[PDB]
Amino acid sequence: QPIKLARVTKVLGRTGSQGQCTQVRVEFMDDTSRSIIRNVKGPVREGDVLTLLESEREARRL
């Protein structure tokens, strides 16, 4: 369970009946970055740090 810093490149958007979940794309800084897309919620700063405390949770779309 290692927390990995992730920088947001694109916010996919909101998911739900009325809109209750979020999805973004994140990549590493200097750690052989991969364009991995995961669910986020709300506030994402300019170049924020998503917590990939797990590398195997790529939140699935559809």
């Binding site: 739900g16 009946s17 209750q20 979940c21 994402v44 924020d48 917590t51 939140a59």
Partner: peptide, 29 residues
């Protein structure tokens, strides 16, 4: 807290799709 979740489907409430955030919205919620 380093994870929470969100509502599920059209029928059913017995689980909750996992979501985690950068510190800002995790602190918010």
């Amino acid at each position: 807290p380093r994870e929470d979740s969100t509502r599920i489907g059209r029928a059913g409430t017995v689980r909750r799709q996992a979501v985690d955030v950068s510190p800002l919205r995790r602190v918010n919620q």
